Amino acid sequence: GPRPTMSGATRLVQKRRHGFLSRVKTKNGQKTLKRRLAKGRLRLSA
Amino acid sequence: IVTPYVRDAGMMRTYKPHTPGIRHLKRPINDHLWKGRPYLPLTFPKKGQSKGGRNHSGRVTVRHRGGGHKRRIRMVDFERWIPGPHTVLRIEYDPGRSAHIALVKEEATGRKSYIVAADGMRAGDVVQSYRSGLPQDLLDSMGGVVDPGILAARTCWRGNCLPVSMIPVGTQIYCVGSRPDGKAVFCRSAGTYATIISKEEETREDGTKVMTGKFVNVRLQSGEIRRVSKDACATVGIASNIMHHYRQLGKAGRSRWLNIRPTVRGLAMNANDHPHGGHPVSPWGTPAKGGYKTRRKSNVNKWVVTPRVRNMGVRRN
Amino acid sequence: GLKYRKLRLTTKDVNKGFYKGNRTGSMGTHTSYGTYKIDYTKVR
RNA sequence: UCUUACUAUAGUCAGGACUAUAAAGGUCCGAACGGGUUAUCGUUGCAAAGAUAUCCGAAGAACUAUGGUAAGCGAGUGAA
RNA sequence: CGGCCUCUAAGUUUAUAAUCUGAAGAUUAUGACGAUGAGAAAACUUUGGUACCAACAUUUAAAAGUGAAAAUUGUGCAGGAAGGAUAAACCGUACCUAGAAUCUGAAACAAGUAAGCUAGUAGAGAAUACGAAGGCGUGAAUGAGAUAACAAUCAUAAAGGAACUCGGCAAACUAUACCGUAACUUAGGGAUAAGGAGAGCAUGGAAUAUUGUUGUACGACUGUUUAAUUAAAACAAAGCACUUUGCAAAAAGACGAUAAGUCUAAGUAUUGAGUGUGAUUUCAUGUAACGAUACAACAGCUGUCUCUAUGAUUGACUCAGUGAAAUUGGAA
RNA sequence: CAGAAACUAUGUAGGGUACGACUGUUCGUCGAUUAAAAAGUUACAUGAGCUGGGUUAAAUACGUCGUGAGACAGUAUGGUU
Ligand SMILES: [K+]
Ligand SMILES: [K+]
Ligand SMILES: [K+]
Ligand SMILES: [K+]
Ligand SMILES: [K+]
Ligand SMILES: [Mg+2]
Ligand SMILES: [Mg+2]
Ligand SMILES: [Mg+2]
Ligand SMILES: [Mg+2]
Ligand SMILES: [Mg+2]
Ligand SMILES: [Mg+2]
Ligand SMILES: [Mg+2]
Ligand SMILES: [Mg+2]
Ligand SMILES: [Mg+2]
Ligand SMILES: [Mg+2]
Ligand SMILES: [Mg+2]
Ligand SMILES: [Mg+2]
Ligand SMILES: [Mg+2]
Ligand SMILES: [Mg+2]
Ligand SMILES: [Mg+2]
Ligand SMILES: [Mg+2]
Ligand SMILES: [Mg+2]
Ligand SMILES: [Mg+2]
Ligand SMILES: [Mg+2]
Ligand SMILES: [Mg+2]
Ligand SMILES: [Mg+2]
Ligand SMILES: [Mg+2]
Ligand SMILES: [Mg+2]
Ligand SMILES: [Mg+2]
Ligand SMILES: [Mg+2]
Ligand SMILES: [Mg+2]
Ligand SMILES: [Mg+2]
Ligand SMILES: [Mg+2]
Ligand SMILES: [Mg+2]
Ligand SMILES: [Mg+2]
Ligand SMILES: [Mg+2]
Ligand SMILES: [Mg+2]
Ligand SMILES: [Mg+2]
Ligand SMILES: [Mg+2]
Ligand SMILES: [Mg+2]
Ligand SMILES: [Mg+2]
Ligand SMILES: [Mg+2]
Ligand SMILES: [Mg+2]
Ligand SMILES: [Mg+2]
Ligand SMILES: [Mg+2]
Ligand SMILES: [Mg+2]
């Protein structure tokens, strides 16, 4: 079953993994942004 | 009459077996070792993921490594180009070297450096490297550039670094080099030494030999007699920790302090990650028994005179 | 954490070195020991 | 952000006993902490792994914190 | 009094240079960036033991004791960072810490989560017991009755004491600086062996506090293992054995759409890797020690049982409030 | 069929047919009592009544078979009813 995998989670690791600067600054992260941007997402990251 | 806690026999220390993990612990006796810290400006820390057996990719490339004690690397001089008398200040213990190191001091300038100490070397001993040539006083006393007899007596002392050419046949050396201007590569480990078999010399009919070739034959610690350069450096002596190979760790936890992790046999694995699980071979298919030689065929040894003697699996004792 | 995690992060939420200004303007320079020297040429 | 290994920087382990040490032990009894031996309950549960008692380790191959590295044609990590 | 700021570690880099490469990219050096670390002064202020600030131990702000801080000295081996230095801006400050309204577990969940302090008595103690302050005795997410069967969690028990049962499962018994201690033994142990003992019924509660002893099988031992049905005889292990590795530009091994190159290693045959074995003793086998392993015997112990009874609480039952679920072709 | 005991057969199922040891089990075997310690059917009568001795696993060791992966009405320990 599901586990409490977000117990003890910090919001600094959330910005380093799924932040905006982690994506504009990488070739593979620019694709995720454009995809979410082309779909209409407001929350492109974090 | 009561037996002491430390039981000294031979040159190996044993302790009272008051625990099952200290019964088989055996240590060599080296009480002369410097009990303080090393010369810091000659050391640097050994940290990072390379300590864990990882290469620049981050993936495990060396198995059974990681989790050992914090260490520092000792910058040891295996070239010894600088000439002049050097005074041994203290013999120290290096975690990353089997043999012991000596912190020498140049009497001319006072700069200190490390060198693999010989068997029997102690503080106060004066060592000298004649790799950069012979001084004027020594050269002038004989009156000739090279005299095969007097030179050996004044310079072939324990701990002196000389070209293999200047060393007489039958001398035991422990920092044998390969290239004319290369560092010591052979016999650097503890207790290891190499004898000089012969030299490419000619007779002048006056009883004085003179060098005519560019190489010399030396028997390495493995027994291989190979061609070594004429200017290759070599220190007279044997490495300090002769009894290193007689030690015993006694418990599994002392192997983990030495940065060694458990070795899982191939039989204890599944067939999905080892040929054995579920002839002897490694996890990747390399024959582990049968005499298969892993030296690349296209790499021929052009310096081999007498190769190593293969045991062919026969038991020794 | 379900929903609040998805809002825009502010300085009143985290403390581990996260700094964010209010665009009040630079009135000086930072020193090497953590102080601040007010350049009165930038003060308005 | 789980978890496995490694990595850097840090923290923690009441008290007592034995042993050659004031400090040298994968030593001993036993809290914190870490485990999960046996039984009972629970099974649309308080809980998609809990409660109670009992049991094991507790200066070490220990445990914990904040970051880092390594995973998906090949297989990462693996005291397996 | 933290951040910001300066410095750097593990590392990151669509930064630059060089190099390798089907493209994507990768490597090395430099730079930048990167805390979980280091950063002048203040009840006024702006070389390498001539060492270092890992673990452990010791000493030190002089009335005594205690706990830090920092330093002093020393011990063991497993041999213990880096770099920089050395007239008051901007941001944080509310509340919540999980038994009573806030974090994670789908939620108002009997679970989980970091640091400091955390009265006193009594103790060797952060054990066990009481509890000063404080908080609480849930948001009707309940309350008042009654005290059947039965269930859960418990208490006591005549005589007997494993007759229960696959099986002693569960439960119960087990109880101070003392005199005396065996075979065996790797000479450390076994060993706290055993055996002798510490006014009224009781020097009295709780915890300490647990069946004991002996002999076998397996594994030397402490450890590890299927998170969440198998904790072990399995894995590991120290020790031992064998094969391979000479380092002259690539030591072997591992990795690299695939190379430069990296780990090995700032190592060098007493090194590294791989393979099997699994201390020592005798050369697969016999002992000391150890085991929440499996099994047998002996002693005690008890509701396991002959054979159940009674007592306690919470449910079950009734009244008031709130109000589910699986399920269902249609039903006399 | 002298008596007693026992044998064979005819009526008759009212009530009884216990307890323990060793055997994984019922198969069985034995111990000592007893008037006697007989059988069968009911989905093993009965697990939305209990047990798990069983009914099936993944772990591990040994044995046998197979070139091997594996197999076995094998053996032993462990295993959410
Ligand atoms: K290895
Ligand atoms: K092994
Ligand atoms: K298997
Ligand atoms: K203990
Ligand atoms: K490319
Ligand atoms: Mg999962
Ligand atoms: Mg975490
Ligand atoms: Mg090994
Ligand atoms: Mg396996
Ligand atoms: Mg806040
Ligand atoms: Mg906060
Ligand atoms: Mg910052
Ligand atoms: Mg993590
Ligand atoms: Mg211990
Ligand atoms: Mg113990
Ligand atoms: Mg576990
Ligand atoms: Mg139920
Ligand atoms: Mg401030
Ligand atoms: Mg920086
Ligand atoms: Mg910080
Ligand atoms: Mg709660
Ligand atoms: Mg609580
Ligand atoms: Mg909640
Ligand atoms: Mg409260
Ligand atoms: Mg109330
Ligand atoms: Mg009774
Ligand atoms: Mg009685
Ligand atoms: Mg019975
Ligand atoms: Mg019985
Ligand atoms: Mg019991
Ligand atoms: Mg074991
Ligand atoms: Mg499990
Ligand atoms: Mg279990
Ligand atoms: Mg052996
Ligand atoms: Mg190579
Ligand atoms: Mg084995
Ligand atoms: Mg064996
Ligand atoms: Mg154990
Ligand atoms: Mg009602
Ligand atoms: Mg008659
Ligand atoms: Mg009648
Ligand atoms: Mg039946
Ligand atoms: Mg039924
Ligand atoms: Mg199997
Ligand atoms: Mg077999
Ligand atoms: Mg078990």
PDB file of N, CA and C (backbone and C1' of nucleotides) in Angstrom, chain F residues 7 14 17-18 24 26-27 33 42 48 50 59 61 64 67-68 70 73 75-76 79:
ATOM      1  P     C F   7     -18.244 -66.698  24.720  1.00  0.00           P
ATOM      2  O5'   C F   7     -18.632 -67.967  23.838  1.00  0.00           O
ATOM      3  C5'   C F   7     -17.647 -68.652  23.078  1.00  0.00           C
ATOM      4  C4'   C F   7     -18.222 -69.851  22.366  1.00  0.00           C
ATOM      5  C3'   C F   7     -19.334 -69.571  21.368  1.00  0.00           C
ATOM      6  O3'   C F   7     -18.858 -69.106  20.118  1.00  0.00           O
ATOM      7  C1'   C F   7     -19.952 -71.389  22.742  1.00  0.00           C
ATOM      8  P     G F  14     -33.715 -46.650  21.819  1.00  0.00           P
ATOM      9  O5'   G F  14     -33.848 -46.886  23.387  1.00  0.00           O
ATOM     10  C5'   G F  14     -34.776 -46.138  24.156  1.00  0.00           C
ATOM     11  C4'   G F  14     -34.408 -46.129  25.617  1.00  0.00           C
ATOM     12  C3'   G F  14     -33.021 -45.608  25.957  1.00  0.00           C
ATOM     13  O3'   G F  14     -32.952 -44.193  25.976  1.00  0.00           O
ATOM     14  C1'   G F  14     -33.409 -47.622  27.123  1.00  0.00           C
ATOM     15  P     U F  17     -20.089 -43.178  28.401  1.00  0.00           P
ATOM     16  O5'   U F  17     -19.286 -44.353  27.691  1.00  0.00           O
ATOM     17  C5'   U F  17     -18.577 -45.309  28.461  1.00  0.00           C
ATOM     18  C4'   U F  17     -18.068 -46.440  27.607  1.00  0.00           C
ATOM     19  C3'   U F  17     -17.358 -46.045  26.324  1.00  0.00           C
ATOM     20  O3'   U F  17     -16.019 -45.632  26.531  1.00  0.00           O
ATOM     21  C1'   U F  17     -18.891 -47.778  25.870  1.00  0.00           C
ATOM     22  P     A F  18     -15.415 -44.385  25.718  1.00  0.00           P
ATOM     23  O5'   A F  18     -14.830 -43.438  26.855  1.00  0.00           O
ATOM     24  C5'   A F  18     -15.694 -42.670  27.678  1.00  0.00           C
ATOM     25  C4'   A F  18     -15.175 -42.574  29.090  1.00  0.00           C
ATOM     26  C3'   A F  18     -13.754 -42.057  29.246  1.00  0.00           C
ATOM     27  O3'   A F  18     -13.654 -40.647  29.169  1.00  0.00           O
ATOM     28  C1'   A F  18     -14.010 -44.002  30.542  1.00  0.00           C
ATOM     29  P     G F  24       5.763 -40.069  14.767  1.00  0.00           P
ATOM     30  O5'   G F  24       4.838 -39.047  15.570  1.00  0.00           O
ATOM     31  C5'   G F  24       3.488 -38.816  15.190  1.00  0.00           C
ATOM     32  C4'   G F  24       3.310 -37.436  14.607  1.00  0.00           C
ATOM     33  C3'   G F  24       1.878 -36.933  14.501  1.00  0.00           C
ATOM     34  O3'   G F  24       1.384 -36.395  15.716  1.00  0.00           O
ATOM     35  C1'   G F  24       2.965 -36.602  12.440  1.00  0.00           C
ATOM     36  P     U F  26      -5.412 -39.879  16.201  1.00  0.00           P
ATOM     37  O5'   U F  26      -6.326 -41.111  15.768  1.00  0.00           O
ATOM     38  C5'   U F  26      -7.628 -40.898  15.231  1.00  0.00           C
ATOM     39  C4'   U F  26      -8.168 -42.123  14.532  1.00  0.00           C
ATOM     40  C3'   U F  26      -7.214 -43.318  14.458  1.00  0.00           C
ATOM     41  O3'   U F  26      -7.960 -44.534  14.523  1.00  0.00           O
ATOM     42  C1'   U F  26      -7.819 -42.684  12.286  1.00  0.00           C
ATOM     43  P     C F  27      -7.262 -45.889  15.033  1.00  0.00           P
ATOM     44  O5'   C F  27      -6.449 -46.404  13.763  1.00  0.00           O
ATOM     45  C5'   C F  27      -7.130 -46.834  12.593  1.00  0.00           C
ATOM     46  C4'   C F  27      -6.177 -47.113  11.457  1.00  0.00           C
ATOM     47  C3'   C F  27      -5.203 -48.261  11.660  1.00  0.00           C
ATOM     48  O3'   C F  27      -5.789 -49.533  11.444  1.00  0.00           O
ATOM     49  C1'   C F  27      -4.044 -46.397  10.793  1.00  0.00           C
ATOM     50  P     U F  33      -5.057 -53.094  37.541  1.00  0.00           P
ATOM     51  O5'   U F  33      -6.113 -51.922  37.745  1.00  0.00           O
ATOM     52  C5'   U F  33      -7.507 -52.182  37.748  1.00  0.00           C
ATOM     53  C4'   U F  33      -8.298 -50.913  37.558  1.00  0.00           C
ATOM     54  C3'   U F  33      -9.800 -51.080  37.401  1.00  0.00           C
ATOM     55  O3'   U F  33     -10.472 -51.243  38.636  1.00  0.00           O
ATOM     56  C1'   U F  33      -8.999 -49.638  35.719  1.00  0.00           C
ATOM     57  P     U F  42     -22.376 -40.179   5.110  1.00  0.00           P
ATOM     58  O5'   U F  42     -23.190 -39.027   5.847  1.00  0.00           O
ATOM     59  C5'   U F  42     -24.526 -38.723   5.475  1.00  0.00           C
ATOM     60  C4'   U F  42     -25.178 -37.804   6.475  1.00  0.00           C
ATOM     61  C3'   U F  42     -24.458 -36.492   6.741  1.00  0.00           C
ATOM     62  O3'   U F  42     -24.758 -35.509   5.767  1.00  0.00           O
ATOM     63  C1'   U F  42     -25.057 -37.501   8.797  1.00  0.00           C
ATOM     64  P     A F  48     -17.805 -21.742   8.850  1.00  0.00           P
ATOM     65  O5'   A F  48     -18.427 -20.337   9.272  1.00  0.00           O
ATOM     66  C5'   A F  48     -17.632 -19.340   9.901  1.00  0.00           C
ATOM     67  C4'   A F  48     -18.195 -17.960   9.672  1.00  0.00           C
ATOM     68  C3'   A F  48     -19.416 -17.591  10.502  1.00  0.00           C
ATOM     69  O3'   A F  48     -19.092 -17.120  11.797  1.00  0.00           O
ATOM     70  C1'   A F  48     -19.843 -17.095   8.246  1.00  0.00           C
ATOM     71  P     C F  50     -15.274 -20.219  13.707  1.00  0.00           P
ATOM     72  O5'   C F  50     -14.292 -20.867  14.776  1.00  0.00           O
ATOM     73  C5'   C F  50     -13.738 -20.083  15.818  1.00  0.00           C
ATOM     74  C4'   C F  50     -13.082 -20.945  16.863  1.00  0.00           C
ATOM     75  C3'   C F  50     -11.773 -21.596  16.462  1.00  0.00           C
ATOM     76  O3'   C F  50     -10.672 -20.709  16.483  1.00  0.00           O
ATOM     77  C1'   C F  50     -13.130 -23.190  17.522  1.00  0.00           C
ATOM     78  P     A F  59      12.486 -19.744  -2.228  1.00  0.00           P
ATOM     79  O5'   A F  59      12.723 -19.355  -0.703  1.00  0.00           O
ATOM     80  C5'   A F  59      13.093 -18.034  -0.337  1.00  0.00           C
ATOM     81  C4'   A F  59      13.744 -18.007   1.021  1.00  0.00           C
ATOM     82  C3'   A F  59      14.873 -19.001   1.228  1.00  0.00           C
ATOM     83  O3'   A F  59      16.106 -18.569   0.682  1.00  0.00           O
ATOM     84  C1'   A F  59      13.397 -19.117   3.058  1.00  0.00           C
ATOM     85  P     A F  61      21.024 -23.384   1.306  1.00  0.00           P
ATOM     86  O5'   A F  61      21.175 -24.773   2.069  1.00  0.00           O
ATOM     87  C5'   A F  61      22.045 -24.892   3.184  1.00  0.00           C
ATOM     88  C4'   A F  61      21.826 -26.180   3.937  1.00  0.00           C
ATOM     89  C3'   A F  61      21.916 -27.463   3.129  1.00  0.00           C
ATOM     90  O3'   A F  61      23.247 -27.869   2.867  1.00  0.00           O
ATOM     91  C1'   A F  61      20.011 -27.547   4.512  1.00  0.00           C
ATOM     92  P     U F  64      22.517 -38.678  -3.248  1.00  0.00           P
ATOM     93  O5'   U F  64      21.293 -39.011  -4.211  1.00  0.00           O
ATOM     94  C5'   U F  64      20.650 -40.276  -4.164  1.00  0.00           C
ATOM     95  C4'   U F  64      19.353 -40.266  -4.932  1.00  0.00           C
ATOM     96  C3'   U F  64      19.439 -39.804  -6.378  1.00  0.00           C
ATOM     97  O3'   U F  64      19.907 -40.811  -7.258  1.00  0.00           O
ATOM     98  C1'   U F  64      17.634 -38.720  -5.324  1.00  0.00           C
ATOM     99  P     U F  67      21.820 -35.596 -17.959  1.00  0.00           P
ATOM    100  O5'   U F  67      22.424 -34.172 -17.579  1.00  0.00           O
ATOM    101  C5'   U F  67      23.811 -34.028 -17.306  1.00  0.00           C
ATOM    102  C4'   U F  67      24.319 -32.654 -17.668  1.00  0.00           C
ATOM    103  C3'   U F  67      23.618 -31.482 -17.001  1.00  0.00           C
ATOM    104  O3'   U F  67      24.091 -31.242 -15.687  1.00  0.00           O
ATOM    105  C1'   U F  67      23.846 -31.051 -19.313  1.00  0.00           C
ATOM    106  P     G F  68      23.057 -31.023 -14.480  1.00  0.00           P
ATOM    107  O5'   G F  68      22.459 -29.572 -14.743  1.00  0.00           O
ATOM    108  C5'   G F  68      23.304 -28.431 -14.769  1.00  0.00           C
ATOM    109  C4'   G F  68      22.625 -27.259 -15.428  1.00  0.00           C
ATOM    110  C3'   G F  68      21.294 -26.841 -14.820  1.00  0.00           C
ATOM    111  O3'   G F  68      21.458 -25.978 -13.708  1.00  0.00           O
ATOM    112  C1'   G F  68      21.050 -27.056 -17.156  1.00  0.00           C
ATOM    113  P     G F  70      15.747 -22.628 -11.131  1.00  0.00           P
ATOM    114  O5'   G F  70      14.389 -23.198 -11.733  1.00  0.00           O
ATOM    115  C5'   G F  70      13.603 -24.129 -11.006  1.00  0.00           C
ATOM    116  C4'   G F  70      13.226 -25.310 -11.860  1.00  0.00           C
ATOM    117  C3'   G F  70      12.524 -26.451 -11.140  1.00  0.00           C
ATOM    118  O3'   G F  70      11.133 -26.231 -10.988  1.00  0.00           O
ATOM    119  C1'   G F  70      14.290 -27.320 -12.430  1.00  0.00           C
ATOM    120  P     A F  73       5.535 -33.994  -5.212  1.00  0.00           P
ATOM    121  O5'   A F  73       4.556 -34.752  -4.211  1.00  0.00           O
ATOM    122  C5'   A F  73       3.903 -35.957  -4.597  1.00  0.00           C
ATOM    123  C4'   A F  73       3.628 -36.844  -3.409  1.00  0.00           C
ATOM    124  C3'   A F  73       4.871 -37.352  -2.682  1.00  0.00           C
ATOM    125  O3'   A F  73       4.616 -37.443  -1.281  1.00  0.00           O
ATOM    126  C1'   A F  73       3.618 -39.190  -3.478  1.00  0.00           C
ATOM    127  P     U F  75       8.260 -36.838   3.336  1.00  0.00           P
ATOM    128  O5'   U F  75       9.611 -36.506   4.109  1.00  0.00           O
ATOM    129  C5'   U F  75      10.394 -37.542   4.682  1.00  0.00           C
ATOM    130  C4'   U F  75      11.666 -37.007   5.288  1.00  0.00           C
ATOM    131  C3'   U F  75      11.511 -35.814   6.219  1.00  0.00           C
ATOM    132  O3'   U F  75      11.102 -36.178   7.526  1.00  0.00           O
ATOM    133  C1'   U F  75      13.259 -35.391   4.695  1.00  0.00           C
ATOM    134  P     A F  76      10.129 -35.212   8.364  1.00  0.00           P
ATOM    135  O5'   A F  76      11.085 -34.034   8.848  1.00  0.00           O
ATOM    136  C5'   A F  76      12.146 -34.292   9.755  1.00  0.00           C
ATOM    137  C4'   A F  76      13.008 -33.074   9.968  1.00  0.00           C
ATOM    138  C3'   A F  76      12.281 -31.779  10.292  1.00  0.00           C
ATOM    139  O3'   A F  76      11.883 -31.684  11.648  1.00  0.00           O
ATOM    140  C1'   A F  76      13.908 -31.370   8.632  1.00  0.00           C
ATOM    141  P     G F  79       6.251 -20.940  12.766  1.00  0.00           P
ATOM    142  O5'   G F  79       5.542 -20.255  11.515  1.00  0.00           O
ATOM    143  C5'   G F  79       5.662 -18.860  11.280  1.00  0.00           C
ATOM    144  C4'   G F  79       5.517 -18.531   9.817  1.00  0.00           C
ATOM    145  C3'   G F  79       4.155 -18.803   9.199  1.00  0.00           C
ATOM    146  O3'   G F  79       3.210 -17.780   9.465  1.00  0.00           O
ATOM    147  C1'   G F  79       5.836 -19.678   7.795  1.00  0.00           C
TER     148        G F  79
END
